[PDB]
């Protein structure tokens, strides 16, 4: 299966983010926006894995998920990847993700033991969309800059989820394979 580990947002942040997506629109650029139900914080893309590996991972996530207490985070600002001059991923950042950053590192090193490749510097983020090609660069850049410091709201990081993704014609469908609530 195709799988990944994620932290999900709440409705208010979700409503706020969709409206922001609608504001960015499709004039400055051709963008595949993430579906409302797929907006989350990716802790780690696992690529193709077996049901059997899926289980090993669950047991590790549970021993890690309990070592961290639930906290509130704030979704703020719009960032672009790779560069402001080479824009492909439009994303919303997180106001203080050190605890989230620390979780990601512990998940990364633990799964590395199983033969999993590590990843680039982790930046806690919620991808809002991906640019297929730019139409009007001045427009996009100015549109995005007006959202540089936007405060979209906050939610409570309360669980860690292992998910399965299935690619369908126009959209990837996600399925929660397991959820591990954090401590208190
Ligand atoms: Cl990506």
UniProtKB/Swiss-Prot annotation:
Known catalytic reactions: a 3'-end 2',3'-cyclophospho-ribonucleotide-RNA + H2O = a 3'-end 2'-phospho-ribonucleotide-RNA + H(+)
InterPro entries, A to Z: Cyclic_Pdiesterase, Phosphoesterase_HXTX, RNA_CPDase
UniProt motif HXTX 1: location: 40-43
Keyword Hydrolase listed: yes
SUPFAM superfamilies: LigT-like (SSF55144)
Superkingdom to which the source organism belongs: Archaea
Active-site residues (renumbered): 40, 125
GO MF annotation, one: RNA 2',3'-cyclic 3'-phosphodiesterase activity
One Pfam family named in its UniProt record: LigT_PEase
Record motif HXTX 2, residues: 125-128
EC number: 3.1.4.58
Keywords for the protein's UniProt record, in alphabetical order: Hydrolase
Function: Hydrolyzes RNA 2',3'-cyclic phosphodiester to an RNA 2'-phosphomonoester.
Family: Belongs to the 2H phosphoesterase superfamily. ThpR family.
Protein name: RNA 2',3'-cyclic phosphodiesterase
